[PDB]
Design a protein around this ligand. Structure first.
Ligand SMILES: Cc1cc2nc3c(=O)[nH]c(=O)nc-3n(C[C@H](O)[C@H](O)[C@H](O)COP(=O)(O)OP(=O)(O)OC[C@H]3O[C@@H](n4cnc5c(N)ncnc54)[C@H](O)[C@@H]3O)c2cc1C
Ligand SMILES: Cc1cc2nc3c(=O)[nH]c(=O)nc-3n(C[C@H](O)[C@H](O)[C@H](O)COP(=O)(O)OP(=O)(O)OC[C@H]3O[C@@H](n4cnc5c(N)ncnc54)[C@H](O)[C@@H]3O)c2cc1C
Lengths: 48, 470, 472
C-alpha cells in the first residue's frame, strides 16, 4: 500500500493525489510516459 | 445568549480560514466563520502582505524614477503627502475586504464577529458585539493565525516602539528608524520608509539577513542594501530606554556602536508565534504543543478527529499560500474526499530591492540532508532585459540532483525576481530534469528566460555565456 | 584577396547565427562568422528587441511615475534630454555587443566583416573592411535574417518616413506620428513615442491589432490603448506624399478621414520579409521559395545536405528565441547528434502597456485544428497584487483539452504579463494536467499565482472568486 518512496517523490501532483487516494505503492506502477514518467492511465490500469 | 448549530465552524478569517470556509460552502457544507476583527482577510489582507506590497510598489517606482536621471529623463524631487498615501493604502484594503464580505454573502457563509473559545468537543462560545453566541458544530477548523513577538525589556507601550502593524499605519516618517531583525518583514518595512525619507538602521544577530536563503543569493542582496541601510550583523540589542528626545538603544556586538544610539522609532520585527494557546482548545481535547502550535497530520486533522487546524497556527513556514492550500484540503476532507496536503515545495519571496525568492531545497538544506547536488547559475549581467531595466546585478540559480539531473530547488535575486518562482516551482512538482527545462523555448528578451539559460549551463549547451562544460 | 578554409561558416550574426557559431565552437568545430554590420547580435541586439525594450522600460517608468501623483507622490513634469537617452540606449547595446565579441574571441571564432554571397556549393565570398575574403567551407549555416517591408508608393528616403531602425534612433519626438501596422513592433514604438510626447495614430487593415492573439485578450488591450492612441481599424493607407510642412497620408476604410491627414513622421511597420533572395544562394544550389524564405527540414537542412538555415530566414514566427534554439540544433546536427527542431511551443510577447503574451494554442488555432477545448480565466480585478500595483484590468487565461484536461495554451494581458509565460510554456511542454498546475503552490500575493488560480477555476475548486462549478 501507500508509502512516500522515491516513485512518489518523482511523481506529479496529480499522480501523488491519485496514489494516496487509492493506497497505491507507486514503486510498483510501471510508468509508460517519456523518461519513465508515471501517467494517470498507468495508475488507473494498476487499480484493476 | 444566541445559540447556533452548524456543520462547520471556522475559527479565524485570514487566508487559511476564509479559504476553508468558502471551500466548505462550495462543497455544500453549512458553514460559519468566527472573526474578532470587523473585516475578513486576517493578517495578510488587513495588516500584512497586501498593505506592504502596496507600499513597496510606491517605493519601487520612486527608485525607478530616480534611476532614470542618468538616462536623460529627470523627474523633480517627489512631493510626498503621507496622508494621501495612507488613504490610498486604505482604499486598496477596503476594496478587497468588501469583496471578501461579498463572496461570504454569495456563498451564504455566516460571519459572527467576536472572540471565540472552545467550551466542549462540539461547542464554541463567541463573545462579541451581539453578546455571546454559542455555536454547536459537527466539525471545527482552527485558523487563528499568529502574532508579533515582543521583547520584555522593550517599552512596547511607547507609541514609538512599533510592530509590523504600527509600521503599516504610516502615521509618520521618522528621521532615524531602527529595524530589529533581518527577517523579511523588517527589511520590507525598512525598504518602504527609506523611499519616504527615513535613515534606516538594521540590527541582525546572525551573519546574514534572511538566514534561510542561500549565501550566494543573499550576498548580492546585501551588497545592494548595504548602501541604503546601515546593517549591523552579529549584533544584539542589549537594552532599550525611552526618553523625551527619542528612543535609546544600546547594542552589544561586532558593529554595535559604543554609545547608546538615538532613534525616532524602533520597529521590532524579530518573528511571530502561533496563537494556539489562546483558544481554550484543550477544553475540546485538542493537543497544543509547548510552543503554541496545534499539530495536525497531512489531512490537517488534530488529535480530535472532527477538529482540524490550518495556516500559521500549525507551523512553519508562516505564509499565506500555505494556509490557503491547507484550507482547501481541510474542507475537502471534511466533505469526504480522500485528499492530503503534501506539497513538494512551498515558495518564499522577499519583496525587497532587489527581490529575494526561492523554492524547494536550498544549498544549506541539501547539505544537511546529505543530497549530492550541483548548482547552475545565470548572471543577469549577461541579460539584455536586465541591463535595459537597470537590474544587472541579479542572478538566477537552479539546484539539480547530481545523478538524476532532476531539479530540486531554485532561487532568484533581482528586480521582479519573485515572478520567476512559478516556473521553478512547477518544474520541481512535475519532476523536470535540466534537459526538460533547457529545451523549452523561453521568450527573449525576458528575465524568466534566465531559468532556461541556467538549465543550459548545467546541460553544457549555453551560448549566451562562456561554456566551461564544452 | 584573402583565402580561408573552415569547417562551418555562419552567414549572419544575429541570435540565430551567433548561437549556432558558438555552439559549433563548443562542439569542437572550426567556425567562422560573416557579418555585414560592425557588431555581432544582428537585428535583435542592435536595432530590435534590446533597444526597444530599453526604451519601453523608460516609457513604463514615465507612466508609472505620473500614475503615482493621484496617490500622494507627485513628481514634477519629467525634463527629457533626447540625446542623453540615445547615449544610454547605445551604452546598453555596446555592453552586450562587447560581450559577444569577447565570447567569439574566447571560443576562437573568427569574424569576417562584410557582405557574404555564395559562389559555389562549398565557397562563399565576402566584401568588407578587409577587401575580398573567399571562404571555403565544409558546412554553411545561412542565418541572414529579415528586413522591414517597404511600399512602392512611399518616399522612404524622406527622413520623416521611418522604419523600425529609424524609430529606434530617436531622431526627434514628432508632434504627430502615424504608425502603419497594428502589429507588435509598431504598437511598441507608438508606446515609446507617446510617453516622450508624440500624439500617436495607428492604422491597421484588420479588425483587431495583434491579429494572432485571441479576441478576449486583445479586447482588454484595445480598451487601454484607445485612451492613448487614435486607433483606425479596418483602414488602409492609399497614398503618402512628402510636403514641406509634413507627410500627407491618404487612407480608405471605416475610420479613414475624407481629407489626407498631415503627420510629422510616419513609421512604416507593416511586417518583415526574409533576406533569402539576397545571398546568391542559387550559386550553391540552395532553393529559395517565392517569398524569399529558405525552407528547411526538422534538422534545419536546406535541399543541399551540408547547408543549413535558421532564424527569420526560414519562416514564421520571426522571433529571436526561435532562432537561438534552431541555431543550437543545426550545430548539434553538423557535429553528428541525432537532434531535431520541433518545439511544442514558441512564446510571443508584446511589451506594450499592458503587455500581451501568449504561448501554445490560441482559441483561434484550436478552432482551426478542430480541438474540443475549455478556457479558464482569472481576472486581475480579483488580485491583491494587481490592485495594490494599480494594474487591476489584467487577465490570465489557460486553455485546456476538454477530454484529457492537459494545458494546451495560455495567454496574459496585464502589466508585467510577459514574465508569466515561462511557467505556462513549460506546463504545456511537460503536458501538465490542470490539477498539476492547480495543486502547485504559487506564492501569494503575486501576479503569477493567477496561473494556479486559473487552473482552480477549471478544476472547480477556486475560492478567491465566485465558483460557478460549486455544488447547488
Ligand atoms: C507585515 C506582514 C507581511 C506579510 N507578507 C507576506 C507575504 O508577502 N506573503 C506571504 O505569503 N505571507 C506574508 N505574511 C504572512 C501572512 O500574513 C500570514 O502567513 C497569513 O496571514 C496567515 O493566515 P492565517 O489564516 O493562518 O492567519 P491570520 O490571517 O493571522 O489569522 C486569522 C484571523 O483570526 C483572528 N483570530 C485569532 N484568534 C481568534 C479568536 N480567538 N477568535 C476570533 N478570531 C480570532 C485573527 O485576528 C485573524 O484576523 C506577512 C505577514 C506580515 C505580518
Ligand atoms: C523593432 C524590433 C523589435 C523586436 N522585438 C523582438 C522581441 O521582443 N522578441 C523577439 O523574439 N523578437 C523580436 N524582434 C525580432 C528579432 O529581432 C528577430 O526575430 C531576430 O533578430 C532574428 O534573428 P536572426 O539571427 O534570424 O536574424 P538577424 O538578427 O536579422 O541577423 C542576421 C544578420 O545577418 C546580417 N546579414 C544579412 N545578410 C547578410 C549577408 N549577405 N552577409 C553578411 N551579413 C548579412 C544582417 O545585417 C544581420 O545582422 C524584433 C524585431 C524588431 C525589428
Amino acid at each position: 500500500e501507500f508509502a512516500e518512496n522515491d516513485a512518489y517523490v518523482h511523481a506529479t501532483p496529480l499522480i501523488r493525489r491519485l496514489a494516496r487516494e487509492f493506497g497505491v505503492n507507486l514503486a510498483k506502477v510501471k510508468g509508460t510516459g517519456r523518461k519513465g514518467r508515471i501517467l494517470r492511465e498507468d495508475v488507473q490500469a494498476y487499480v484493476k | 445568549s444566541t445559540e447556533i448549530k452548524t456543520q462547520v465552524v471556522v475559527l479565524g478569517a485570514g487566508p487559511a480560514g476564509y479559504s476553508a470556509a468558502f471551500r466548505c460552502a462550495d462543497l455544500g457544507l453549512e458553514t460559519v466563520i468566527v472573526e474578532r476583527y470587523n473585516t475578513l482577510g486576517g493578517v495578510c489582507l488587513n495588516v500584512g502582505c497586501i498593505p506592504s506590497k502596496a507600499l513597496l510598489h510606491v517605493a519601487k517606482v520612486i527608485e525607478e524614477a530616480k534611476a532614470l536621471a542618468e538616462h536623460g529623463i529627470v523627474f523633480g524631487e517627489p512631493k510626498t503627502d503621507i496622508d494621501k498615501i495612507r488613504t490610498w493604502k486604505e482604499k486598496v484594503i477596503n476594496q478587497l475586504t468588501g469583496g471578501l464580505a461579498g463572496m461570504a454573502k454569495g456563498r451564504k457563509v455566516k460571519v459572527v464577529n467576536g472572540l471565540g473559545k472552545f467550551t466542549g468537543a462540539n461547542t464554541l462560545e463567541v463573545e462579541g458585539e451581539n453578546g455571546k453566541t454559542v455555536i454547536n458544530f459537527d466539525n471545527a477548523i482552527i485558523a487563528a493565525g499568529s502574532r508579533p513577538i515582543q521583547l520584555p525589556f522593550i517599552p512596547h507601550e511607547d507609541p514609538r516602539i512599533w510592530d509590523s502593524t504600527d509600521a503599516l499605519e504610516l502615521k509618520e516618517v521618522p528621521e532615524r528608524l531602527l529595524v530589529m531583525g533581518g527577517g523579511i518583514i523588517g527589511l520590507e518595512m525598512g525598504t518602504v520608509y527609506h523611499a519616504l525619507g527615513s535613515q534606516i538602521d538594521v540590527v541582525e544577530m546572525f551573519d546574514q539577513v534572511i538566514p534561510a536563503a542561500d549565501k550566494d543569493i543573499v550576498k548580492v542582496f546585501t551588497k545592494r542594501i548595504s548602501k541604503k541601510f546601515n546593517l549591523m550583523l552579529e549584533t544584539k540589542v542589549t537594552a532599550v530606554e525611552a526618553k523625551e528626545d527619542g528612543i535609546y538603544v544600546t547594542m552589544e556586538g561586532k558593529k554595535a556602536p559604543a554609545e547608546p544610539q538615538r532613534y525616532d522609532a524602533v520597529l521590532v520585527a524579530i518573528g511571530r508565534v502561533p496563537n494556539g494557546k489562546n483558544l481554550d482548545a484543550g477544553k475540546a481535547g485538542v493537543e497544543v504543543d509547548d510552543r503554541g502550535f496545534i499539530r495536525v497530520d497531512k489531512q490537517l486533522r488534530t488529535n480530535v478527529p472532527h477538529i482540524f487546524a490550518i495556516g500559521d497556527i500549525v507551523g512553519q513556514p508562516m505564509l499565506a499560500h500555505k494556509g490557503v492550500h491547507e484550507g482547501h484540503v481541510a474542507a475537502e476532507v471534511i466533505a469526504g474526499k480522500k485528499h492530503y496536503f503534501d506539497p513538494k515545495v512551498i515558495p518564499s519571496i522577499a519583496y525587497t530591492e532587489p527581490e529575494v525568492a526561492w523554492v524547494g531545497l536550498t544549498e544549506k538544506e541539501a547539505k544537511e540532508k546529505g543530497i549530492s547536488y550541483e548548482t547552475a547559475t545565470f548572471p543577469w549581467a549577461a541579460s539584455g532585459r536586465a541591463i535595459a531595466s537597470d537590474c544587472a546585478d541579479g542572478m538566477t540559480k537552479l539546484i539539480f540532483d547530481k545523478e538524476s539531473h532532476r531539479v530540486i530547488g531554485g532561487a532568484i535575486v533581482g528586480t521582479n525576481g519573485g515572478e520567476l518562482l512559478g516556473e521553478i516551482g512547477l518544474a520541481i512538482e512535475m519532476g523536470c530534469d535540466a534537459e526538460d527545462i533547457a529545451l523549452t523555448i523561453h521568450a527573449h528578451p525576458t528575465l524568466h528566460e534566465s531559468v532556461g539559460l541556467a538549465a543550459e549551463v548545467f546541460e553544457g549547451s549555453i551560448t549566451d555565456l562562456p561554456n566551461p562544460k564544452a
